[PDB]
Each structure stands twice: as C-alpha cells, then as structure tokens.
Design an enzyme around this catalytic site. Sequence first.
Site, PDB file in Angstrom:
ATOM      1  NE  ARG A 194     -17.821   5.275  -4.462  1.00 25.30           N
ATOM      2  CZ  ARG A 194     -16.703   5.959  -4.802  1.00 25.30           C
ATOM      3  NH1 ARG A 194     -15.678   5.622  -4.024  1.00 25.30           N
ATOM      4  NH2 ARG A 194     -16.660   6.458  -5.896  1.00 25.30           N
ATOM      5  CG  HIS A 253      -5.144   5.921  -1.350  1.00 20.40           C
ATOM      6  ND1 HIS A 253      -6.012   4.879  -1.572  1.00 20.40           N
ATOM      7  CD2 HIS A 253      -5.345   6.639  -2.689  1.00 20.40           C
ATOM      8  CE1 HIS A 253      -6.462   4.795  -2.890  1.00 20.40           C
ATOM      9  NE2 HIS A 253      -6.056   5.823  -3.288  1.00 20.40           N
ATOM     10  CE1 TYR A 307      -4.190   5.403   5.781  1.00 20.14           C
ATOM     11  CE2 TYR A 307      -4.481   4.846   3.609  1.00 20.14           C
ATOM     12  CZ  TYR A 307      -4.773   5.026   4.612  1.00 20.14           C
ATOM     13  OH  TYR A 307      -6.329   5.324   4.786  1.00 20.14           O
ATOM     14  CG  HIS A 309      -2.207   0.986   1.121  1.00 26.26           C
ATOM     15  ND1 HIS A 309      -1.825   1.995   0.227  1.00 26.26           N
ATOM     16  CD2 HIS A 309      -3.226   1.186   1.714  1.00 26.26           C
ATOM     17  CE1 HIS A 309      -3.302   2.703   0.229  1.00 26.26           C
ATOM     18  NE2 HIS A 309      -3.855   2.228   1.172  1.00 26.26           N
TER      19      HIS A 309
HETATM   20  C1  LIG Z   1     -15.343   2.213   1.989  1.00 26.27           C
HETATM   21  C2  LIG Z   1     -13.938   2.438   1.328  1.00 26.27           C
HETATM   22  C3  LIG Z   1     -12.890   1.635   1.766  1.00 26.27           C
HETATM   23  C4  LIG Z   1     -11.674   1.810   0.744  1.00 26.27           C
HETATM   24  N1  LIG Z   1     -10.464   1.191   1.464  1.00 26.27           N
HETATM   25  C5  LIG Z   1      -9.364   1.339   0.845  1.00 26.27           C
HETATM   26  C6  LIG Z   1      -8.336   0.407   1.391  1.00 26.27           C
HETATM   27  O1  LIG Z   1      -8.188  -0.170   2.452  1.00 26.27           O
HETATM   28  N2  LIG Z   1      -7.057   0.351   0.785  1.00 26.27           N
HETATM   29  C7  LIG Z   1      -6.939   1.204  -0.580  1.00 26.27           C
HETATM   30  O2  LIG Z   1      -5.716   1.314  -1.147  1.00 26.27           O
HETATM   31  N3  LIG Z   1      -8.186   1.956  -0.913  1.00 26.27           N
HETATM   32  C8  LIG Z   1      -9.444   1.892  -0.388  1.00 26.27           C
HETATM   33  N4  LIG Z   1     -10.478   2.584  -0.979  1.00 26.27           N
HETATM   34  C9  LIG Z   1     -10.294   3.224  -2.155  1.00 26.27           C
HETATM   35  C10 LIG Z   1     -10.821   2.363  -3.069  1.00 26.27           C
HETATM   36  O3  LIG Z   1     -10.151   1.162  -3.021  1.00 26.27           O
HETATM   37  C11 LIG Z   1     -11.190   2.786  -4.581  1.00 26.27           C
HETATM   38  O4  LIG Z   1      -9.867   2.718  -5.381  1.00 26.27           O
HETATM   39  C12 LIG Z   1     -11.611   4.133  -4.702  1.00 26.27           C
HETATM   40  O5  LIG Z   1     -12.895   4.197  -3.839  1.00 26.27           O
HETATM   41  C13 LIG Z   1     -12.101   4.593  -6.019  1.00 26.27           C
HETATM   42  O6  LIG Z   1     -12.854   3.456  -6.930  1.00 26.27           O
HETATM   43  P1  LIG Z   1     -14.442   3.209  -6.963  1.00 26.27           P
HETATM   44  O7  LIG Z   1     -14.844   4.242  -7.569  1.00 26.27           O
HETATM   45  O8  LIG Z   1     -14.610   1.888  -7.882  1.00 26.27           O
HETATM   46  O9  LIG Z   1     -14.855   3.105  -5.624  1.00 26.27           O
HETATM   47  C14 LIG Z   1     -11.483   2.543  -0.186  1.00 26.27           C
HETATM   48  C15 LIG Z   1     -12.679   3.291  -0.571  1.00 26.27           C
HETATM   49  C16 LIG Z   1     -13.838   3.347  -0.151  1.00 26.27           C
HETATM   50  C17 LIG Z   1     -15.028   3.855  -0.453  1.00 26.27           C
END
Ligand SMILES: Cc1cc2nc3c(=O)[nH]c(=O)nc-3n(C[C@H](O)[C@H](O)[C@H](O)COP(=O)(O)O)c2cc1C
Length: 362
Positions: free
Chosen positions: A322, A182, A184, A179
């Site tokens: 999502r 974002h 971290y 990871h």
């Molecule tokens: C509830 C939630 C939890 C997420 N947790 C992680 C995570 O643990 N690690 C990570 O790299 N991204 C995390 N993300 C970002 C998502 O993995 C994803 O890349 C982002 O929501 C955009 O993609 P999408 O439009 O398909 O939702 C999270 C997003 C949401 C909404």
Amino acid sequence: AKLFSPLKVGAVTVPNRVFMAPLTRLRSIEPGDIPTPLMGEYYRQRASSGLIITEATQISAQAKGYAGAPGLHSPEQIAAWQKITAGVHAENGHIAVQLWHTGRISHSSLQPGGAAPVAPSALSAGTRTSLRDENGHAIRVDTSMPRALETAEIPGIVNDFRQAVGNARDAGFDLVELHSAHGYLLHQFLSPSANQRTDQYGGSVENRARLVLEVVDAVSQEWSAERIGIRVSPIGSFQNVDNGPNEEEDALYLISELAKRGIAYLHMSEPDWAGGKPYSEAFRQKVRDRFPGVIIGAGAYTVEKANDLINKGLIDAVAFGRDYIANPDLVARLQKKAPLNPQRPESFYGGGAEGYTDYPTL
Ligand SMILES: Cc1cc2nc3c(=O)[nH]c(=O)nc-3n(C[C@H](O)[C@H](O)[C@H](O)COP(=O)(O)O)c2cc1C
Ligand code: NA
C-alpha cells in the site's frame, strides 16, 4: 543501508531491495483485458523500485476472475505490456509480471462462454470477487460455484502457465512471479480446505504440491529457472483458504522442492498483514535453511523490520504494497526518512488517474 544495496535475483541484478509488491488495481480495458498507457505511467512513476512486480495478470481467458485485471495471453495484451516494460526500462527500472489463474475466486460472467470457473474441487470459495457495474465501477459479487478439473485437464493448466511465461519473455519482462498464494488456483490445490480430490493431485502434501511443481518445471524449461519467482502464503488463512493442520511442515516441504529447482526467488506473503500470527524467527530460519536463494518478505513491514531481517540473513528484500500505491518515490522517501503520503483506499480498485497516478513525489 543494506536495504538500498544491489541484489542479484536469478539472472537479474537490481539496484536496491525496496520492491513493489503486486497490487490489483482493476483499471484494464474491457473487452480484451488490455493494459493501458495510464497503467504504463503508474509503473513508470515507480521505476526507482529495485523490482516492480506487476498486478496479478491472467495466463489465459479462463484464468480471469476480476473485471479490470489484465491478461498476457493475446497479441493485443502483449503489445500493450511491451510498451509498459519499455517505459519502465527507460527509467533504468526492472519489472516482473505476476501470473495467476484465479480458480474458484471468479464469476461465471467473466468466464469464456459464461461457464462456471474451474478449481481442484467443486467447493464454493465462500468469498467475493470484483465485477464492474453498468457504469464501469468496481463492485463486489459472490463467487460462482466452480467445476472440478478433470485429471486430464491438469496438463492444460500447466500448458497455459507455460505459454504465459513465454509471452512474458516476449513482452520484455525481467522475471515472472507465479501466483501461488492468497487462495487462487495454485493455492487452492495446495490447501486441504479447497482440495478434496481423489486423484494424484489431492490428499497428501506431495499430491497437493504436484501442480505447482509441474508448473515451476514447465516454465523453467520454457524460459529459465533463474527467471522464475513464486509468491506463497503458506502459513495462516487468506481469502477463506487455510493451509491445513500441518501447515508448517507442509510449507517447508514445498520450499525445499522449490530450492531443488533453482528458482530465482521465494516471495512470502505473511499473515501479520491480514490478521494472523507473524512469522517467528525460528520458522524464518527453517525457511532459510532450506532456501539459500533470494527470499522476499511482505506484509506490514517497517524499515526497522526490513533492516533487521535483512541484516540477520533471513530475507534478502522486501515488497511494499500500500505504501507503493501512495508513494511513487518510496525508495527516496525511505532513504531520506521523509514522511509518506496518506493512502486513499477509496480509489485502490477501479477508476482512472485519480488515486493512481496522482500521488506526488517529494
Ligand atoms: C489493493 C491491493 C491489491 C493487491 N493485489 C495483489 C495481487 O494482485 N497479487 C498479490 O499477490 N497480492 C496482492 N495484494 C497483497 C499485497 O501485494 C501485499 O502483499 C499486502 O497488501 C501486504 O503488504 P503491505 O502491508 O505492504 O500492503 C494486494 C493488496 C492490496 C491492498
Ligand atoms: Na465423471
């Protein structure tokens, strides 16, 4: 149709390119940060995905920054993950564990000894993390001021990633995902806005990328470079961490270093999801020019976008976030152009089965 064709991802061959993005859900057991059979059912329901990528999982107790996030550093945690991976593989699925250290996006109440969390520099994250209130419900709280890592502590970070990847292999995962996105710990070191260090881990892009490349090298030797994926968010701003004034060139430097090490994939979390400017095709081609291995695109993807970029050779697979929360058979729904269940965002974080395992199949 190519989105639904097999793909070799390092050592592993997956049946399609509709991947499950890593999603923090904060349903683990405290104390001990233990995955649960409920989590196993959640992942089992989604094993028609070509590759499940788990929620972010602690490499160590120090790595923790969210109440309810699981670990992969204790015998209890390993045992529970082993049942999860067994459950996914018995559906003929594939699964990778995302491994993080949260760095300064943490709270001292979650840290061993109640100490301040660690970071490249003693600088507030200026954001919040999630604790649990006395009734076990997720709450948002300001992050604690971090302590700057001493130079002599950096090998311990590398060593903790190394052992966590060893445990991931012991626990039955097909791949790991570092990871590095974002905001971290790994992204904190990459970012000139979080990293003001004066030793060999700060300043220039070579110094700022040093930790993540030391981690990639260590985990590749522990297991195999063809077992290592990495998630990056190197263009734009995420959780108050930007990528500096030379973000494009710096990103392409890191990508070329990653390509030299033969890793299994590059997973790019794009800004179009958060609220930034979306990747231009010219940038995507520069990435592809430097990284001939698997590229995973993520963030606000249509099936149209997915086919387009995949047919153009710019990415190889897509991670849906999502939409995978709400649709366990997303793969079938996308093939059949069926509609999608609506999301219940009020149950994304914390809680139990409702908003988690209770979304229905076609
Ligand atoms: C509830 C939630 C939890 C997420 N947790 C992680 C995570 O643990 N690690 C990570 O790299 N991204 C995390 N993300 C970002 C998502 O993995 C994803 O890349 C982002 O929501 C955009 O993609 P999408 O439009 O398909 O939702 C999270 C997003 C949401 C909404
Ligand atoms: Na000192």
